[PDB]
Enzyme design. Structure first.
Site, mmCIF file in Angstrom:
data_model
loop_
_atom_site.group_PDB
_atom_site.id
_atom_site.type_symbol
_atom_site.label_atom_id
_atom_site.label_comp_id
_atom_site.label_asym_id
_atom_site.label_seq_id
_atom_site.Cartn_x
_atom_site.Cartn_y
_atom_site.Cartn_z
ATOM 1 N N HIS A 158 0.841 -1.230 0.000
ATOM 2 C CA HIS A 158 0.000 0.000 0.000
ATOM 3 C C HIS A 158 0.865 1.265 0.000
ATOM 4 C CE1 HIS A 158 -0.111 -0.346 4.585
ATOM 5 N NE2 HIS A 158 0.368 0.877 4.357
ATOM 6 N N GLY A 186 1.862 5.842 14.324
ATOM 7 C CA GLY A 186 2.517 5.805 12.992
ATOM 8 C C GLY A 186 3.685 4.827 12.953
ATOM 9 N N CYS A 207 3.602 1.771 10.358
ATOM 10 C CA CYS A 207 3.241 0.807 9.314
ATOM 11 C C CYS A 207 4.484 0.070 8.882
ATOM 12 C CB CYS A 207 2.580 1.456 8.105
ATOM 13 S SG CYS A 207 0.908 0.815 7.893
#
EC number: 3.4.19.12
Lengths: 300, 300
Positions: free
Chosen positions: B40, B142, B144
């Site tokens: 992504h 935060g 990922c």
């Protein structure tokens, strides 16, 4: 749930070694050409009852210390004592030595421990120095000499070395200059810790964490004075809150829009009323081992 | 308190890198000459609503990926997708690559996460794969592309890579071959998790931990059959206990002298009666994110 997060342990993993003296093996910390470990390594089971560490150390030669880094024997070329920490000089500077300093932390502050067994890293967890200078909770079965640390920018700040277990199950240790935290001595005799207290500023940080994580039920429309809060705190064995502690909570207060004294009013009601079967961050008990910095580190 | 202990993170710290594609930066894992990260990363905010990953990937050149290891740019020489994981081939094999394998873990199993922000290791904690293939609790704001792992003898077993947050706050991700755990997809659309359940075998392991740590009040003089236990379990949204699960608890049963079905009778009474204002290991709630192996690792 609000997770305990430890510092990454890699910089400290490369410093852990095994120290053996006779039948006793424990952990040591290898920084430049010095290995640090608890001086009680030189004691027999009988010696621990009333040791004269100066006499015991004089009777030891360099060859009575076996220091192993992985499967690799390091030659000891010097032995000395600084307070309760044995310093073994070795012929090889550790090539994995990080940037480091030795600090003495305050009661209520947190640190990471690399739990080791006979020099071998096993696990990492976050610990708080209790107001009575013990370390509470569960520990790796057999782990003497494991060290506590914080990571500051690039720098490892070593703050703790495990020496002792109290019959209650709590741990006691020293800073890396060998000074005990609290009233304890490295002798097998009756030793009591002081009465423990709840670290108020940490409970407030954890309530801010709850709010940031969407747990808000305990917020009420009230405020309090620092003075009126402290009268309640004292009754529930909470540390008094000082303006300096209020200032430490500024960033969490700014992030949430909840004034510190409003969070104090929420905490006063929780102490006086209990939780009525509800949870905060999946706990039925107020948690006091997250500092304001720990919450900002994780939440900001 | 019974402490969550993470694996030492050093072997994984040396593999963490930053991946940037346009305005999106997240974590990548650098093993030999391949960087793994969530696919992504190639998506705009608008792309996420209904991505055609094959088309988006075709439109990317090697120079559209900025991979940084510390302050050091790695040149990408190849980009491909394996399920939901982007593989960037780079011109330099990571000299810090550990011995590693890629495994797919079972619901109820635990692992350590090295929480990173833009390629920079921040903290380490222990996580459990819930029976509904989510990861619960608080996370580094935060993060990922952070990875989950276990350390087997010398070998890092990578089991998880963080992809997604569900609006409930829970995390979803993949194995390192890019297969999601659970029914989830890397698209910004309505996705529900299944109903979660309590990991019975882990609750029993944690009660054994309590006993080993001297918390014994909940032990009763009773036994049960696996069948009669499971009738109660089902009513309290507990997973059924199987003979294979009973066998996994053998070592804790041997260490404590408490038969598994006797601990099952204790757990049946706790579910039916509650704790009556008492705690186990400092908790008012039964804990289900310690495996039998986690308890033996810490307690034996």
């Amino acid at each position: 749930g609000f997770r305990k997060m430890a510092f990454p342990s890699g910089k400290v993993e490369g410093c852990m070694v095994q120290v053996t003296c006779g039948t006793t093996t424990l952990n040591g910390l290898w920084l430049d050409d010095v290995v640090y470990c608890p001086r009680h390594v030189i004691c027999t089971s009988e010696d621990m009852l009333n040791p004269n560490y100066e006499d015991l150390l004089i009777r030891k030669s360099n060859h009575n210390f076996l220091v192993q880094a992985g499967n690799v024997q390091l030659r000891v070329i010097g032995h000395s004592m600084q307070n309760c920490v044995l310093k073994l000089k070795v012929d090889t500077a550790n090539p994995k030595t990080p940037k480091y300093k030795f600090v003495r932390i305050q009661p209520g502050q947190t640190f990471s421990v690399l739990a080791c067994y006979n020099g071998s890293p096993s696990g990492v967890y976050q610990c708080a120095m209790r107001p009575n200078f013990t370390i509470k909770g569960s520990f790796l079965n057999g782990s003497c000499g494991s060290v506590g640390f914080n990571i500051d920018y690039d720098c490892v700040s070593f703050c703790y070395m495990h020496h002792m277990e109290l019959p209650t199950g709590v741990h006691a240790g020293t800073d890396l200059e060998g000074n005990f935290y609290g009233p304890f001595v490295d002798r097998q005799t009756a030793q009591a810790a002081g009465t423990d207290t709840t670290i108020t500023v940490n409970v407030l940080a954890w309530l801010y964490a709850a709010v940031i994580n969407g747990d808000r039920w305990f917020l009420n429309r009230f405020t309090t004075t620092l003075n009126d809060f402290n009268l309640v705190a004292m009754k529930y064995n909470y540390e008094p809150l000082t303006q300096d502690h209020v200032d430490i909570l500024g960033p969490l207060s700014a992030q949430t829009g909840i004034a510190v004294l409003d969070m104090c009013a929420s905490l006063k009601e929780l102490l006086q009323n209990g939780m009525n079967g509800r949870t905060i961050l999946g706990s039925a008990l107020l948690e006091d081992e997250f500092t304001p910095f720990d919450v900002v580190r994780q939440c900001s």
